N, CA, C and O atoms as a GROMACS GRO file, in nm:
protein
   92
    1UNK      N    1   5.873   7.217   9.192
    1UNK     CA    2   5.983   7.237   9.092
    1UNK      C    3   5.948   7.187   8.949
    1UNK      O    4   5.851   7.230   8.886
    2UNK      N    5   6.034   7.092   8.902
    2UNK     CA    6   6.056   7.125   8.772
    2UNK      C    7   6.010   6.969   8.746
    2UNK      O    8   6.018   6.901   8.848
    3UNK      N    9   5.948   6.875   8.589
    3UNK     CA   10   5.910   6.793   8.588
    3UNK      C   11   5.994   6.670   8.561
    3UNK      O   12   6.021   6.626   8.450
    4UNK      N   13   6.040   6.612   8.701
    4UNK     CA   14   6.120   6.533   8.752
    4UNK      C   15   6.075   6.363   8.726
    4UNK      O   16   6.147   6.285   8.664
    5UNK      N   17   5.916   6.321   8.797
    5UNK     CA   18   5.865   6.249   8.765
    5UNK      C   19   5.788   6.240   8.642
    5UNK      O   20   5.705   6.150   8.625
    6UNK      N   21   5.808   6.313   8.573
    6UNK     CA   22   5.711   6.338   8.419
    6UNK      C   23   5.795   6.292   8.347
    6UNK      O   24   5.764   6.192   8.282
    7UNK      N   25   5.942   6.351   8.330
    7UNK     CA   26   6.074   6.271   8.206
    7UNK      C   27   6.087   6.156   8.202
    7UNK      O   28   6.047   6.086   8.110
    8UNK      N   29   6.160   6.109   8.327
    8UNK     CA   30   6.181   5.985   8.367
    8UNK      C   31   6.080   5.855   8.395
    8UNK      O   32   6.076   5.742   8.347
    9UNK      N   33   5.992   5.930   8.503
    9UNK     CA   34   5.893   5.787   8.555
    9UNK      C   35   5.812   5.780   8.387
    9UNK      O   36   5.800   5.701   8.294
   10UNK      N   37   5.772   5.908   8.421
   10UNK     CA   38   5.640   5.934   8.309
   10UNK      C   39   5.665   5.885   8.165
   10UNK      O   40   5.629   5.771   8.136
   11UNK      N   41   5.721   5.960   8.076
   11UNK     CA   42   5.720   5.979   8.010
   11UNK      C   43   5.865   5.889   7.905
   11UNK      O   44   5.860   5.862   7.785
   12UNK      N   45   5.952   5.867   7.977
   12UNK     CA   46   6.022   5.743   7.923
   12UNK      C   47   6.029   5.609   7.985
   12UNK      O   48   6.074   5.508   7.929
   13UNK      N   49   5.976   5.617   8.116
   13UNK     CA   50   5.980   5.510   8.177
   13UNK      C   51   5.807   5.446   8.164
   13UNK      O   52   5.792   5.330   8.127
   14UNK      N   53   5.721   5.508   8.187
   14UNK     CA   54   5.515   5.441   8.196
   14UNK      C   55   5.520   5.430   8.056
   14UNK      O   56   5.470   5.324   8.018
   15UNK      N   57   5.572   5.519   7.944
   15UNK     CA   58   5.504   5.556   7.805
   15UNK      C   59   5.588   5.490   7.744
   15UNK      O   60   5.586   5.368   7.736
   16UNK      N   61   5.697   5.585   7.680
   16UNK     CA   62   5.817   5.522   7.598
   16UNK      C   63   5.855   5.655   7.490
   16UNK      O   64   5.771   5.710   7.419
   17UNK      N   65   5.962   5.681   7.495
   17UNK     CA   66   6.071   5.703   7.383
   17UNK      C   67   6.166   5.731   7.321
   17UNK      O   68   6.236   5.793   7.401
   18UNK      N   69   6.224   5.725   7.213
   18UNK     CA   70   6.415   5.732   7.213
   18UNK      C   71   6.444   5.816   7.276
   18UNK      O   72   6.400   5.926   7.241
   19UNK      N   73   6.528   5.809   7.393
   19UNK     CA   74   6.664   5.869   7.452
   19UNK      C   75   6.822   5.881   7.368
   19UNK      O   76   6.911   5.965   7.382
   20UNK      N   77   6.817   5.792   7.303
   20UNK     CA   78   6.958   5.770   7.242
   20UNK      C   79   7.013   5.627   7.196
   20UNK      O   80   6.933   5.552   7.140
   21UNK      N   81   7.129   5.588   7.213
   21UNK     CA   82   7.216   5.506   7.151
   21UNK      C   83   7.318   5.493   7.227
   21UNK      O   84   7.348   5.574   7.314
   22UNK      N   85   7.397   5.363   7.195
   22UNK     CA   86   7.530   5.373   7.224
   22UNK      C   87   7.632   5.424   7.109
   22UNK      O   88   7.714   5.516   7.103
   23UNK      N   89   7.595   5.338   7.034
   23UNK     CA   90   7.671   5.347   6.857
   23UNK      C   91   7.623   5.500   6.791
   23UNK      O   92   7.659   5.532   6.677
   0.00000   0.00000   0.00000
């Protein structure tokens, strides 16, 4: 399927970068 462990594990979680905010 579709890249599940790449967004999350990978790529914001091993690497890093902005998702967002609260404010």
């Amino acid at each position: 399927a579709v890249g599940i462990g790449a967004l999350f594990l990978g790529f914001l979680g091993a690497a890093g970068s902005t998702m967002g905010a609260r404010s």
